[PDB]
Amino acid sequence: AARQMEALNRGLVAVKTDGGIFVSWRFLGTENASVLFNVYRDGQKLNAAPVKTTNYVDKNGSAGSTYTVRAVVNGTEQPASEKASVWAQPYHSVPLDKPAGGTTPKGESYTYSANDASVGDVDGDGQYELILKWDPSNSKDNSQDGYTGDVLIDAYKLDGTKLWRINLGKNIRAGAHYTQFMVYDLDGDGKAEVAMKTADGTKDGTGKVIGNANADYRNEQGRVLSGPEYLTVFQGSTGKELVTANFEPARGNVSDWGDSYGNRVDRFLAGIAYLDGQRPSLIMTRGYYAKTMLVAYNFRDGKLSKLWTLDSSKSGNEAFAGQGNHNLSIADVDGDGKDEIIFGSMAVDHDGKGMYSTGLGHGDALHTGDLDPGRPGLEVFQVHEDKNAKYGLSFRDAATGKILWGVYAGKDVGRGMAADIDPRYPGQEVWANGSLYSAKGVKIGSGVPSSTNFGIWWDGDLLREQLDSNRIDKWDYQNGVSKNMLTASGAAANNGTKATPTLQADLLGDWREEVVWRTEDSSALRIYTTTIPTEHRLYTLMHDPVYRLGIAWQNIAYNQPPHTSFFLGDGMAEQPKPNMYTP
């Protein structure tokens, strides 16, 4: 059946290039193969015949010019899109209200840098707002003791209007593995809510404190190991607390999670999953090294509701322990139209049953998509941390978990990538541990892409490019070397050596993905959209069931790139029209 997706505007963007005014727009999933377009500069039509593809270069437009696009459905023109002005720079600059540094109880001062982002349409105007986590200098991996400054989540319209700031406060430790924020229209009112784990002292967008404004559950290591734990759905448009229930999976004893000093307990992941196969559910997960819990929520009709819990420590679920990554994927792997949860080396079914465990355990990178088009169903490429794992890299049937192939590594293979980078081999290539492989497992020559981080559809072809740091690279499959396509100067990635963008997403223009990177001084976010023309028209990736969810989970823990439900790549079958509705 049809999934709830977002009512998007035309996402019409206009960028000044050397070649003229590059203009792209969304091919909406509401629209048919027969939909064509007309581009208007300042009110006059630029194309003789309606164009098929959703990008256009206006060789005569200037910076002052404004663009609209008109669809042509079934013979007749449609009402104009929103007016788009031309970006003077190849990025749009979103000025941030940069929070002042602070002092921890220990006298240590910290500063803020803009960190992981997510997007939602929070005021329902058809355009994505940027939901931005601020990270304090002293933020901590679960293994490191020390106090951390307050986590701050801002929401920004692309014009730079700071809608609100949520201050998570003293009782939410700052760090990659702590706050996993879900930004999504959970209840289908066309506006996104922001849901995340909150604590006493959490100050919402209106300046209201959740729970006990004065409670301080920070232990002397600056961890928060006692005290209540909340889940708050916030109103997107105001940052107003909508509902706050107690967080699940509950902490219990720190030790249940496989250590006593407070590491494994605070290993959060979060997702959006269409578990009913139609409307989004919220997934909050705790732990992955040993004890592992996934609980599913619906936020609907102003009510937060627990859908199910999977608990590794509950009898029968033994296999589903120690399998989680610092990331997850959400997809319909059994073709039943409901989403399952690729949870590293294990998969949780749409009803919360553990489907399989490869038993290969924890890893730092996970890739779920149609990695092998010549095989029906989805494949999961996964790398594994444990040096004695049967494989360091596994390539498995996403549905059954049966390993189609793996390669024994012998060490911590800490990065893995799937992407169609080589058209000489049908499907997405995978690379980890100094070797690039075909979907079938055949080692492709020698050499790998210079990054094993993100893949991004950035240029005009169906091959995916690589993203790492402030760079987008392209794989020269014939020569076996990576080539740089973009270095975003003055922009920087986040999360140290994970070097993730603030966000990567198709959030404006055509099917290629935008990168959002904070400036070095986090005074602004830079939205880069591609100006490389493509002859391919694809539905906005944000209307792809697997991709859109992928964006929801991008921020979580160790940011993975988003994948599409269908094989998008060289020799792909014409893509399915998405089975969707908007509110």
Ligand X SMILES: O=C(O)[C@H]1O[C@H](O[C@@H]2[C@H](O)[C@@H](O)[C@@H](O)O[C@@H]2C(=O)O)[C@H](O)[C@@H](O)[C@H]1O
Range in contact with Ca ion (rule: CB under 5 A) among 1-9, 89-97, 312-320, 501-509: 501-509
Q: How far is the CB of 496 from ligand X (least distance, A)?
A: 5
Residues 415-434 that bind ligand X (CB under 6 A): 415
Pick from ligand X, Ca ion, none: which does 375 bind, CB < 5 to 8 A by kind?
A: Ca ion
141, interface contact from ligand X, Ca ion, none, CB < 5-8 Å by kind = ligand X
Kindly report the number of other CB atoms within 10 A of residue 327's CB atom: 24
Q: Which is nearer to ligand X, 94 or 493 (CB)?
A: 493
Q: Taking the complex as a whole, how short is the minimal distance between the CB of residue 222 and ligand X, in angstroms?
A: 15
Three-state DSSP state, 501: coil
Tell me the C-alpha to C-alpha distance, in Å, between residue 472 and each of 249, 466, 478.
37, 5, 19
Reported residue count of the chain is: 583
User: Is 41 known to sit in a ligand binding site?
Assistant: no
Q: Could you give the 3-state DSSP secondary structure of residue 541? A: helix
Please choose, from the candidates 82, 233, 72, the residue with its C-alpha nearest in 3D space to the C-alpha of residue 166.
Answer: 233
Can you say whether the dihedral through the CA atoms of 404, 409, 411, 415 is positive or negative? negative
Partner that binds at residue 121, options ligand X, Ca ion, none, CB closer than 5 to 8 Å by kind: Ca ion
- Which of Ca ion, ligand X, none binds 349 (CB below 5-8 Å, type-dependent)? Ca ion
- Token pair for residue 26? 């969304």
CA 80 to each of CA 9, 21, 38, 50, 89: distance values in angstroms, whole numbers, following the listed order: 11, 19, 9, 14, 25
Q: Residue 216 or residue 461: which is nearer to Ca ion going by CB?
A: 461
Residue 146 interacts with ligand X (CB under 6 A)? no
Report 304-333 residues binding Ca ion (CB under 5 A): 332
Among Ca ion, ligand X, none, residue 115 binds (CB under 5-8 Å by kind) = none
Which residue, 415 or 548, has its beta carbon nearer to ligand X?
415
31 is in an annotated binding site: no
229 among annotated binding-site residues: no
Q: If DSSP codes are grouped into helix, strand and coil, which group holds residue 261?
A: coil
Closer residue to ligand X, CB minimum distance, 38 or 494:
494
User: 418 to 477, contacts with Ca ion by CB under 5 A?
Assistant: 420, 422, 425, 459, 461, 463
Question: What DSSP string describes 306-329?
Answer: EEEEEETTSTT-GGGSS---SS-E
Closest CA to 317 of 294, 344, 285, 286: 294
Instruction: Work out which of 42, 97, 141, 351 binds ligand X, going by CB under 6 A.
Output: 141
Q: Binder to ligand X among 302, 359, 496, 583 (CB under 6 A)?
A: 496
Q: How far is the CB of 105 from Ca ion (least distance, A)?
A: 26
Compute, in degrees rounded to 10, the torsion defined by CA atoms 79, 34, 190, 126. Answer: -50
What are the CA-CA distances from residue 562 to residues 120, 197, 504 (Å)?
16, 23, 8
Instruction: Report the residue number, 363 or 401, with the smaller CB distance to ligand X.
Output: 363
Q: How far apart are the first and last CA of the chain?
A: 15
The tokens describing 445, both together, are 């020559």
Q: Is 170 annotated as a binding residue?
A: yes
Cα separation, 208 vs 481, in Å, equals 53
18 is in an annotated binding site: no
> What's the closest the beta carbon of residue 289 comes to ligand X, in angstroms?
11
Residue 19 binds ligand X (CB under 6 A): no
Query: Can you say whether the dihedral through the CA atoms of 343, 351, 118, 303 is positive or negative?
Result: negative
| Minimum separation from the CB atom of position 518 to Ca ion (A) | 14
Binding partner of residue 498 among ligand X, Ca ion, none, CB cut-off 5 to 8 Å per kind:
ligand X
Contact region with Ca ion (CB under 5 A), list: 45-53, 55-63, 402-410, 554-562: 554-562
CA distance linking residue 266 with residue 225, whole number of Å:
9
Q: Which of 77, 125, 256, 386 binds Ca ion (CB under 5 A)?
A: 125
Task: Give Cα separations from 524 to 93, 155, 498, 529 (angstroms).
Answer: 6, 13, 21, 16
Stretch that binds ligand X, among 54-62, 278-286, 491-499, 513-521 (CB under 6 A): 491-499
Collapsing DSSP states into helix, strand and coil, what is residue 405? strand
Question: Are the beta carbons of 177 and 266 closer than 8 angstroms?
Answer: yes
How far is residue 550's CA from residue 559's CA, in Å, rounded to a whole number? 10
Question: For the range 410-415, what are the long-range contacts, defined as Cβ-Cβ under 8 Å and sequence gap of 24 or more?
Answer: 411/387, 412/385, 412/386, 412/387, 413/363, 413/383, 413/384, 413/385, 414/364, 414/365, 414/383, 414/385, 415/364, 415/365, 415/383, 415/452, 415/453
In the region spanning residues 350 to 389, those forming contacts with ligand X, defined by CB under 6 A, are 364
Residue 497 in the binding site for ligand X (CB under 6 A): yes
Tokens 């232990």 map to which residue? 219
**Encoded amino acid at 525, one letter:** L
Binding site for Ca ion (CB under 5 A): 116, 121, 123, 125, 127, 129, 176, 185, 187, 189, 191, 193, 332, 334, 336, 338, 340, 349-350, 364, 370, 372, 375, 385, 420, 422, 425, 459, 461, 463, 506, 509, 512, 559
Binding site for ligand X (CB under 6 A): 141, 364, 414-415, 496-498
Please state the residue numbers annotated as binding site for Ca(2+): 116, 121, 123, 125, 127, 129, 185, 187, 189, 191, 193, 326, 332, 334, 336, 338, 340, 349-350, 362, 364, 370, 372, 375, 377, 379, 385, 420, 422, 425, 427, 429, 459, 461, 463, 465, 506, 508, 510, 512, 514, 555, 557, 559
Please state the residue numbers annotated as binding site for a carbohydrate: 150, 170, 201, 218
